């Protein structure tokens, strides 16, 4: 019974060392300090014609812009929210009646 | 082929030198022949066949 106690004491350290060396390896692959440094900024924009889009730039991500026409908004405002897999109205997504700004990366992959 | 066997195949050391010589000379013979077919199939299309070669102002 005594020897189990003494052995368990050093097993605490052995598991602790194993944890540290594995977690150091794993975390060294996490985002570096300079990578995390470039993670916030904002830019300004101009304008475009009715019915076309111009991709713009950010961290590594493009942002879409699409000023919509009148029949365009009629089309975008006749969709059943229930039938959508992600129920959301167009007015919620837009801060302007026609100017549609959105992050242009597919939510799949 | 037995007369050939008596000079070259009797000792492996000679037969090895025979394979090295044939690798050398066989490779050179194919090199020349493939190049001759390429020259004959591409008449006039070479860099030495540029008419105004050397005359750029």
């Amino acid at each position: 019974a005594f020897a189990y106690f003494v052995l368990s004491g050093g097993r605490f350290v052995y598991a602790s060392v194993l944890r540290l060396l594995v977690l150091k390896l794993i975390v060294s692959m996490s985002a570096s300090k300079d990578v995390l440094a470039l993670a916030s900024l904002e830019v300004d924009l101009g304008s475009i014609e009715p019915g076309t889009t111009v991709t713009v730039k950010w961290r590594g991500k493009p942002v879409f812009i699409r000023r919509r026409t009148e029949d365009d908004i009629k089309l975008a405002n006749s969709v059943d929210v229930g039938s959508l897999r992600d129920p959301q109205e167009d007015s919620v997504r837009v801060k302007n009646p026609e100017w549609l700004v959105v992050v242009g990366v597919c939510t799949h992959l | 082929f037995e007369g050939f066997y008596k000079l070259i195949m009797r000792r492996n050391s000679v037969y090895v030198t025979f394979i090295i010589a044939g690798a050398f000379f066989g490779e050179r013979a194919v090199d020349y022949g493939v190049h001759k077919l390429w020259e004959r199939n591409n008449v006039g299309k070479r860099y030495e066949d540029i008419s105004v070669l050397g005359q750029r102002p």
Binding site: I26, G60, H108, L109 | -
Partner: protein, 387 residues
């Protein structure tokens, strides 16, 4: 005998292990040329390692220099185009040879007892090959490389709670950038050596019981030494493979590829057509067949679950398709279905390819669900077919 003196050097302890596993190992005398693809895959692995080591002496794993270092290999170093084309088309030859190898074991039921562990080690090797070839294809840093690396790291996001933290840990940042490229280069150097160890264990499992044969029967009554009989038979295949490889290398070094990877990677614009290398297309087709993120990733894992569970189905006692007419017919339908899946993955996602992709994916999984039924039903064949 008492070994007082020294006989053949092959039986000395300096060479006894090499002699008994490569020179004198008993082999079934009726092996056909379909048994020569294991050595062909071993040669392809060596060709990949040797050329890649020498290519790594000229490649720079940096997003600002990676594309140009590959162009500098093709333009400046002597014989650099050959090292590059032997490595880029060698990965294709590695996958053609291994695919023929896999379907040989499927046709003759080489996965059945006692060789279950041999198949299981092979499935692991296939996984190691896929990862190794994928991360290597990212290294040139072209349009296909960038957008290919983007989606496959994004595959981890299918897990709900910790999916996003795995994707970002894989990238080393919030996007595919130099951190992704530099770590992909390091893993691409290490993984082929793990492939070498895995194939050695794969071979050792095979030598526990010996190779299967086209008749699928017990073969101990007719066995011959591997050398010279199957060495010279493999040597026929090695030269045939060299002619096949050389045609691709010298006369069509770019047909098994997409021109989009000759455009430097542009993170702002996706190409209109984005596809993996051809050896990944059947997996691609099964992935897109599911209109769900988690469903698609789960189907990809279930592909390797079904391969791993195949040797453990309770089956009939007959191995070879040459005596299994129903299983023989299903094998050729699976082969056609696998060719169809690869072609579907090469197509844009629209009608009618979605319906065809979904049916092709279903039929592929039907092969593994029906096979245990076949052996279970065919267990009663001897009691029903009487003399």
């Amino acid at each position: 005998t008492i070994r007082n003196q020294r006989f053949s050097l092959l039986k000395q302890p300096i060479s006894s292990t090499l002699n008994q596993h490569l020179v004198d190992y008993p082999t079934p005398s009726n092996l056909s040329y379909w048994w020569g693809f294991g050595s062909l895959a071993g040669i392809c692995l060596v060709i990949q390692i040797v050329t890649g080591v020498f290519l790594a002496m000229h490649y720079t794993p940096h997003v600002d220099l990676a594309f140009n270092s590959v162009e500098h290999i093709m333009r400046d170093v002597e014989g650099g185009w050959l090292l590059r084309y032997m490595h880029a088309n060698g990965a294709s030859m590695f996958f053609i040879v291994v695919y023929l190898h896999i379907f040989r074991g499927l046709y003759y039921a080489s996965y059945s007892s006692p060789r279950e562990f041999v198949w299981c080690l092979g499935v692991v090797i296939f996984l190691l090959m896929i990862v190794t070839a994928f991360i290597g294809y990212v290294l040139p840093w072209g349009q296909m490389s960038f957008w290919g690396a983007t989606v496959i790291t994004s595959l981890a996001s299918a897990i709900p709670v910790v999916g996003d933290t795995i994707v970002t840990w894989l990238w080393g940042g919030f996007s595919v950038d130099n951190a992704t490229l530099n770590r992909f280069f390091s893993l691409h150097y290490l993984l082929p050596f793990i492939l070498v160890g895995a194939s050695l264990l794969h071979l050792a499992a095979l030598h526990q019981y010996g190779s299967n044969n086209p008749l699928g029967v017990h073969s101990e009554m007719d066995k011959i030494a591997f050398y010279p009989y199957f060495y010279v038979k493999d040597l026929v295949g090695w030269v045939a493979f060299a002619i096949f490889f050389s045609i691709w290398i010298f006369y069509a070094p770019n047909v098994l590829g997409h021109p989009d990877n000759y455009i430097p990677a542009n993170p702002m614009s996706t190409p209109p057509h984005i596809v993996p290398e051809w050896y990944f297309l059947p997996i691609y087709a099964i992935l897109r067949s599911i209109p769900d993120k988690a469903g698609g990733v789960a189907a990809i894992a279930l592909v390797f679950i079904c391969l791993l569970a195949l040797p453990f189905f309770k089956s009939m006692y007959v191995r070879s398709s040459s005596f299994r007419p129903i299983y023989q017919g299903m094998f050729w339908l699976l082969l056609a279905d696998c060719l169809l899946l690869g072609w579907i993955g090469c197509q844009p996602v629209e009608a009618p390819f979605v319906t065809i992709g979904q049916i092709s994916s279903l039929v592929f999984f039907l092969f593994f669900a029906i096979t245990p039924i076949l052996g279970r039903v065919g267990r009663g064949i001897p009691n029903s077919y009487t003399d």
